Design a protein around this ligand. Sequence first.
Ligand code: B12
Ligand SMILES: [Cl-]
Ligand SMILES: [Cl-]
Ligand SMILES: [Cl-]
Length: 414
Amino acid sequence: NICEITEVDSTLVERLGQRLLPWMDRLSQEQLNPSIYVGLRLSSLQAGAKEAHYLHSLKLSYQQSLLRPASNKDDNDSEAKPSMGQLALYLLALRANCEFIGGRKGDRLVSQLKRFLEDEKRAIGHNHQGHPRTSYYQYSLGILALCVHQKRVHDSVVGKLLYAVEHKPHLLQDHVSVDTMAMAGMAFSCLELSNLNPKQRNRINLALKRVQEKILKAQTPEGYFGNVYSTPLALQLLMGSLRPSVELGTACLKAKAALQASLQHKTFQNPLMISQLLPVLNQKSYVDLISPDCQAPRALLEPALETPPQAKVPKFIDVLLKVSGISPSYRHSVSVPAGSSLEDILKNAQEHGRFRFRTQASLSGPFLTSVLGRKAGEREFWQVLRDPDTPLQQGIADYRPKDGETIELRLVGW
Ligand code: B12
Ligand SMILES: [Cl-]
Ligand SMILES: [Cl-]
Ligand SMILES: [Cl-]
C-alpha cells in the first residue's frame, strides 16, 4: 500500500518509544493513558509487561471510577473520573489486548458510551444547528470504539456524523479539521468492514470518499495533512485505501516524506502524539483493532538510562508572556534556560510574579483551562500563540519557546 510508511529508521522508532516508556510507571488516575497503551500495542515496540500492569491499571481505574455506586456519600463529585472519549480510548485499549469488552461491568461501560453519543446526538440537534458538548472527534472516536468491539450504534447516532461530514462548506474548525476527518473516516471504515449499519452502507461509503477528499484538500505545501501532528491520524485513515488514486498516491508520498523529515528533528515529544504516530510507523491504524494481532512480536524497549549531564551553563532565553481576550490584559517578562517548556515559564511567572493559571489533566498532558482566574467557558479555550498570531502546535508542557519570543495566551471562542 502506497499510503503506508514502508521504511523507518528503527533507531528513530526506538527513540520515540523510549519517550513513552517512563509513562508506563505513571499509573495514577490522571496519568493513566489508554492512548499510550494502544500506540505501543500497535507499534513495533514493547514497553515490557510494564504493559500488562498498565492495562490492568486502566481496567481497575476506568471501572472503579466509571461504575461508582448509585448515590455517593455526601459529595456529588469525589475523584473526578475519565471522560467518555477517554472511555472510548479505553475500549481501544482492550481491543489492543485482543479482548472484547464484556461481563456486566463491560455492559455498563458500553451503555455509558452509548448514552454519551445519544447525548451528543441531542446536543448537535435536529438539523445540526447546535454543537457537540465535546467534539466530532470524540463523537467519531466513540463510534469507532464501539465498532471495534462489534457494538452497534443507533443509525441516528451515525447519521449525525455522516451528515456533518456530508453537508455544506465544512463545519469543522481548522484546528480540529484533518484529525476529526481521520477519526470519522476510521469510524466509517470500521462501520463498513463490520457491516454494523447496513441501512446506511452507501452513505457511509460516500462519507469515506468525502473524508479522503477533504484530507487531501488539507495538504500543506510542506506535505503535511493539516499539520505535522494531524499527519499520523491522516495516514492511519489513508493506509486503509479502498479508493486508490494517483492524487492519493502522490499525496501520501509527500505526506510520508514530510513526516520522516520531522522525525529527524525531534518533532514528536508529546506522549499522545507518539502514541498516534507509532502505529503508523508499524503500518497499523485504530481500524486494525477490529481484528488485532496480539501474537506479533515487538522489540523490547529498555530504559534509556543516561540523561546527559553537561555541567555547562545553559543558554537562557528571554521570553515575553502576554495574556489577551480578558480584561485586564497582562504581560510578564521571564528569562529561563533554553529548553524550558511554556509550562515551566507559566509556573515561573506564577511563582515569581502576579501570574496565575490552572491546567487540567488530559491524555495530551496539561491542558490550560484558566488564566489569571478566567476559566475558559463553553466554547472557549485558552489559545496559545507565538506573536504574531501563530497558534502553537504544541501545548504548554511540550512547547519549548525560542529566544525573543512573545507567547500569547488568548481566550478565544471556537
Ligand atoms: C478537540 C481538540 C481541541 C479542542 C478541545 C476542546 C473540546 N471541544 O473538546 C480545542 C479547540 C479547545 C483544542 C485546543 C488546543 N489544541 Co487541540 N485538539 C483537539 C483534537 C481535534 C481532539 C482531542 C480529543 O478530544 N481527544 C480525545 C479525548 C478522549 O482526549 P482527551 O485527552 O481527553 O482530550 C482533551 C485534550 O485533547 C484537550 N486538548 C485539546 N487539544 C489539546 C492540546 C494539548 C497539547 C493538550 C495538552 C490538550 C488538548 O481537549 C480535550 C478535552 O476535551 C486533537 C486531535 C488529535 N490528534 O488528538 C487536537 C490536538 C490534541 N490539539 C492540539 C493543539 C496544538 C491544541 C492547542 C495547543 C492549540 C493552541 N495553539 O492553542 C490547544 C490547547 C491549548 C490549551 N488550552 O492547553 C494538537 C497537539 C499537538 C501536540 N504536539 O501535542 C492536536 C493533535 C491537533 C493538531 N494536529 O495539531 N483542541
Ligand atoms: Cl452505568
Ligand atoms: Cl510534540
Ligand atoms: Cl487561573
